[PDB]
């Protein structure tokens, strides 16, 4: 209604005297470390419940309908997961059975340590692509060709199918172990803010580039062409050019089958997504298309007659655990860090989505610890890095999922598909498995439709999307992520280095101050010039602050004093022979400052000293308490620059200046 | 005196209606490029006067009194320049002849393009070290030994004295040209803010740690030992151990003569600095100690009898210009970027010190063009990077310097020191030249005494000093600078990601709001809870802003709503069978925000949505004009979240709630 106040002009000291402060808490490092480590059993029970969240949702079960919901979601997600594993095994350059291994053990491990309920841990296209890329870069194909086979002219250096897969599997296991170790280190040290740097446009561009690279790789697999494992800089462009040059050496049957299953899967997925109000349970198009592909490929001998590319390499059994070949961490530390951070980011995103959809809370450090333990347990069983795919996750959420029991049942399907089932998947073409991956790329290919929206929105974030998407295409995929985080941090620094300063003026008959470049009927005080500077002054925006002051006052405090001294020597010689007109004061509305960066408080003191020589006072308006306490420690309040120069509000400074002008002409 | 106002509670819309805004300026890209490139004669005269600042101080000269002070300082700095110029050549692994070339040619170029008056362009101890650091790594000593000389058992692979320097001289010329091009790029593209990242603790710790590497490198010449040109990681640590292991192979003639001039040059310099009130002109101790060193070394045959290390390699002549060996810019691009930025940082640092004392403004972007053409012109005559030493600069200013005429006269002394003079410096020991460099290291060795001062001051800046000083010792000197720039920028992100939020309360009978953790007698409104959050919300601190709200209200907006649904299902079944207590509203005092980072502004709409379900209003207090216009573009003002939720001041949000509850119970 009515906003009326009546108080004296407390600038800095008229308010600090009669206001008793609170005594700061003593450090007492001994008592701090003693009180932190609790001795009562309450803290022990709390940390046990937090570290192992399985003991929370188990006692409060609702078996009656939860049993049926979990068993149906488990069989469905198990089918989907074994299909996605046998499909993504090609993205990691590992055999097909190791994908099923990586789709089984992580599920068992993410049961006594996970803190989620609607997450299906397993393979992931982007993570498997990164694993395969680093495996190809660390163990390429031109390092295994053994000369044997009595060739025509030279030594018969044919393909090394065999012991090469063992080396690739050992390398993938070492990479997974290193990723798990990095995740456990990030979880135990309670460092979780490191993944907050992955903004929405950054991860969007990263996923778009990863989807492009996955499309290129799966197109190489479908066409049944052999490239030269180009890796490094412009690897995707080079391999795409090599594919375009090797179009003649394709397989017509494999290409036709792949295109047909792509069209079928895309049409079925679009029909199920659009007309959702008629069929709530998503039709498992992957399962039926894989069954019909295995049925058609088994009838006619596509391997012999049509020379198709089938798997025919399923051993259908387990294997004893193999110790990882430790010693390759120095040359893969950055790759493992990138894989771990992207896996944790995707996992946290999916968890937060399916938690705010079902109204429950998911911890971050617990998810980090759970995924670290899962990757460590997977490294001991010849598996690659595990994550949660959004397509596989939606299955248990749509079909009905309450706890992780549906996830444990999803491993029973993989369990029976490892020991007994799998012989029927022998004549399955690799082009069919390479198609469902492309069909799942529709969710990430449509992410490019946000650039026009982000451009109308904050433009600095729209550039981060395009920068991350392009930079993660030229120089690899893992190196492109590091180039995005640094670019995002540089963009943040540039937004606090080049602020939006204004010409704050006074609204008539009130005390509210608005910018002069946005409103017209604003009257500024006679002689006084007000200035606001956001983005607190640090070592980078000191020259920017100087230029802002020089532009808002019209002149320079240095050149005016130089001209005054040049005109003063003409006065001291005349006795022997015989600019700063409008600016009366400068009220700096430094209300949007947080830190001071003492290198900047030196410049502030220099400004106050320079303007004092030209008879121009530099007052402050909205200096915070934590900022004044910092400036006082940095040696700013000398015998001449007292606290009376600072004020509490913007109108207090103007009122004090008007009263001083009225009382002193 | 009296601060009294009487205005209605204009929140956001009661102020926006009757306040007509100013129309934004039209882009008009066709006219923007036309109005920028002016055609009048004033634009042509302005670009020539700024690019060539010689046409300013030359017409208004004071030959009557200025020429007398420049001829005495020119011959004074010429003797100091010809000694420091040839002494710094040892740090660049180039012969002593090319050291005088770097003190004559850069002066001629820094006469028509320079924008300063008290700067003596020439070599520099830190800059020459970075130049010689890459010469040892690109052309090491074990890459030129030629087997010849009928050795004892194996081929006589003795030293390559002779054509070995030709590979080092041509390498320094290519490095000099690449540094000059980068400086012209920064000057041509008008990008000068890149050197603002070199903060005072960053450049302070870099020059301090560089003084250690100069001390270790010059100690090798004093002791006259032969190391193994260790470069890379821990280069200074490895070469220091090798010196201690080779103490037995020292030279008592070079050590005693080297340690003697260390004490003499340090004592006279310290005595002259303290007792300045008796002798205004600094005594050239560096000059008198070199002449007496050559006289003693010429009398007794120190080369033959005492086996001392002398130069005896001064041809005393010029050379035709040699074209730079283009093709080495790819492997020296990362090294030249670190040298081109320190050659400009020290130039502006030393320039501005002697500019505020003589009261003349030095152009910023012109120094990039000035030293740019200087290094380019120096590359065509077999020189290294040119800079301005603080020790050599203080000579021309203390003895009397007005313009660059004293610098040109200083080049005449170096001019005669090449054609005629120079034969007398033949028996000069290398330990004497390697000692005057160590004596000047006192200015940088005493910079360690600021770490205790910076610790009592802003502690984040004291860590950057120690980080830069240590990191520039482990991994080289040029790589340590880049590790400091990224660490300094990272500290700015850490200060804006972890802000200093408070519990702002109300002062009785007034309208000023202060933090509750600093003052005691502060009354908060009944039910209303105020929160202030500096360091504007971006993608990194968006999660910390959630934890900040959860801590100031006591509860969580998510878990409380989850318990409400857990308690609501018991209500919908009872009809079939038969927390948020204190927090009334939330006033976010977002007055210290500058940008939005729409990635983070989506959570602001989520926070209002999360608190609206629990019947808690989330109001805003001090949102700026440039931020509210950004919220509308990012899709924040929907049909439910209107502008009435925002307020102009903090007390308007409290006054609105007190009247709303009074009128609506
Ligand atoms: Cl997916
Ligand atoms: Cl010096």
CSV table of N, CA and C in Angstrom, one decimal, chain B residues 130 133-134 137 202 206 213 231-235 331-339 341-342 467-487:
chain,number,residue,atom,x,y,z
B,130,UNK,N,63.5,-17.8,-21.4
B,130,UNK,CA,62.5,-18.5,-22.2
B,130,UNK,C,62.9,-18.7,-23.6
B,133,UNK,N,65.5,-21.4,-23.5
B,133,UNK,CA,65.0,-22.7,-23.0
B,133,UNK,C,64.5,-23.6,-24.1
B,134,UNK,N,63.9,-23.0,-25.2
B,134,UNK,CA,63.5,-23.8,-26.3
B,134,UNK,C,64.6,-24.1,-27.3
B,137,UNK,N,66.1,-27.3,-26.2
B,137,UNK,CA,65.2,-28.5,-26.4
B,137,UNK,C,65.1,-28.8,-27.9
B,202,UNK,N,50.0,-13.6,-10.1
B,202,UNK,CA,50.5,-14.5,-11.2
B,202,UNK,C,51.8,-14.0,-11.8
B,206,UNK,N,55.5,-15.7,-11.1
B,206,UNK,CA,56.2,-16.2,-12.3
B,206,UNK,C,57.6,-15.6,-12.3
B,213,UNK,N,65.4,-20.1,-11.8
B,213,UNK,CA,66.0,-20.7,-13.0
B,213,UNK,C,67.1,-19.9,-13.6
B,231,UNK,N,66.0,-30.6,-20.0
B,231,UNK,CA,64.8,-29.8,-20.3
B,231,UNK,C,63.6,-30.6,-20.3
B,232,UNK,N,62.4,-30.0,-20.0
B,232,UNK,CA,61.2,-30.7,-19.9
B,232,UNK,C,60.5,-30.5,-18.5
B,233,UNK,N,60.4,-31.7,-17.8
B,233,UNK,CA,59.8,-31.7,-16.5
B,233,UNK,C,60.9,-31.8,-15.4
B,234,UNK,N,60.8,-30.9,-14.4
B,234,UNK,CA,61.8,-30.8,-13.4
B,234,UNK,C,63.2,-30.5,-14.0
B,235,UNK,N,63.2,-29.6,-15.0
B,235,UNK,CA,64.5,-29.2,-15.6
B,235,UNK,C,65.4,-28.5,-14.7
B,331,UNK,N,56.1,-26.1,-34.5
B,331,UNK,CA,56.7,-26.7,-33.3
B,331,UNK,C,57.1,-25.7,-32.2
B,332,UNK,N,57.0,-24.4,-32.5
B,332,UNK,CA,57.3,-23.3,-31.6
B,332,UNK,C,56.1,-22.4,-31.3
B,333,UNK,N,54.9,-22.8,-31.7
B,333,UNK,CA,53.7,-21.9,-31.6
B,333,UNK,C,53.3,-21.8,-30.1
B,334,UNK,N,53.3,-22.9,-29.4
B,334,UNK,CA,53.0,-22.9,-28.0
B,334,UNK,C,54.0,-22.2,-27.1
B,335,UNK,N,55.3,-22.3,-27.5
B,335,UNK,CA,56.4,-21.6,-26.8
B,335,UNK,C,56.4,-20.1,-27.1
B,336,UNK,N,56.1,-19.7,-28.3
B,336,UNK,CA,56.1,-18.3,-28.6
B,336,UNK,C,54.9,-17.5,-28.0
B,337,UNK,N,53.8,-18.2,-27.7
B,337,UNK,CA,52.7,-17.6,-27.1
B,337,UNK,C,53.0,-17.2,-25.7
B,338,UNK,N,53.8,-18.0,-25.0
B,338,UNK,CA,54.2,-17.6,-23.6
B,338,UNK,C,55.2,-16.5,-23.6
B,339,UNK,N,56.1,-16.4,-24.6
B,339,UNK,CA,57.1,-15.4,-24.6
B,339,UNK,C,56.5,-14.1,-25.1
B,341,UNK,N,53.6,-12.9,-24.6
B,341,UNK,CA,52.7,-12.3,-23.6
B,341,UNK,C,53.5,-11.8,-22.4
B,342,UNK,N,54.7,-12.4,-22.1
B,342,UNK,CA,55.5,-11.8,-21.0
B,342,UNK,C,56.3,-10.6,-21.5
B,467,UNK,N,50.9,-21.2,-6.2
B,467,UNK,CA,50.7,-22.2,-7.3
B,467,UNK,C,51.5,-21.9,-8.6
B,468,UNK,N,51.5,-20.6,-8.9
B,468,UNK,CA,52.3,-20.2,-10.1
B,468,UNK,C,53.8,-20.4,-9.9
B,469,UNK,N,54.3,-20.1,-8.7
B,469,UNK,CA,55.7,-20.2,-8.4
B,469,UNK,C,56.2,-21.6,-8.4
B,470,UNK,N,55.3,-22.5,-7.9
B,470,UNK,CA,55.7,-23.9,-7.8
B,470,UNK,C,55.5,-24.6,-9.2
B,471,UNK,N,54.4,-24.3,-9.9
B,471,UNK,CA,54.1,-25.0,-11.1
B,471,UNK,C,55.1,-24.5,-12.2
B,472,UNK,N,55.6,-23.3,-12.1
B,472,UNK,CA,56.6,-22.9,-13.1
B,472,UNK,C,58.0,-23.3,-12.7
B,473,UNK,N,58.1,-24.3,-11.8
B,473,UNK,CA,59.4,-24.9,-11.4
B,473,UNK,C,59.4,-26.4,-11.8
B,474,UNK,N,58.3,-27.1,-11.6
B,474,UNK,CA,58.2,-28.5,-11.9
B,474,UNK,C,58.2,-28.7,-13.5
B,475,UNK,N,57.1,-28.2,-14.1
B,475,UNK,CA,57.0,-28.4,-15.6
B,475,UNK,C,57.4,-27.1,-16.3
B,476,UNK,N,58.7,-27.0,-16.5
B,476,UNK,CA,59.3,-25.9,-17.3
B,476,UNK,C,58.9,-24.5,-16.7
B,477,UNK,N,59.2,-23.5,-17.6
B,477,UNK,CA,58.9,-22.1,-17.3
B,477,UNK,C,57.8,-21.6,-18.2
B,478,UNK,N,57.8,-21.9,-19.4
B,478,UNK,CA,56.7,-21.5,-20.3
B,478,UNK,C,55.4,-22.2,-20.1
B,479,UNK,N,55.5,-23.5,-19.8
B,479,UNK,CA,54.3,-24.3,-19.5
B,479,UNK,C,53.8,-24.0,-18.1
B,480,UNK,N,54.6,-23.5,-17.2
B,480,UNK,CA,54.1,-23.0,-15.9
B,480,UNK,C,53.3,-21.8,-16.0
B,481,UNK,N,53.5,-20.9,-17.0
B,481,UNK,CA,52.7,-19.7,-17.1
B,481,UNK,C,51.3,-20.1,-17.6
B,482,UNK,N,51.1,-21.0,-18.5
B,482,UNK,CA,49.8,-21.4,-18.9
B,482,UNK,C,49.1,-22.1,-17.8
B,483,UNK,N,49.8,-22.8,-17.0
B,483,UNK,CA,49.2,-23.5,-15.8
B,483,UNK,C,48.7,-22.5,-14.8
B,484,UNK,N,49.3,-21.3,-14.8
B,484,UNK,CA,48.9,-20.2,-13.9
B,484,UNK,C,47.7,-19.4,-14.4
B,485,UNK,N,47.7,-19.2,-15.7
B,485,UNK,CA,46.5,-18.5,-16.3
B,485,UNK,C,45.2,-19.3,-16.2
B,486,UNK,N,45.3,-20.6,-16.4
B,486,UNK,CA,44.1,-21.4,-16.2
B,486,UNK,C,43.7,-21.6,-14.8
B,487,UNK,N,44.7,-21.6,-13.9
B,487,UNK,CA,44.4,-21.7,-12.5
B,487,UNK,C,43.8,-20.4,-11.9
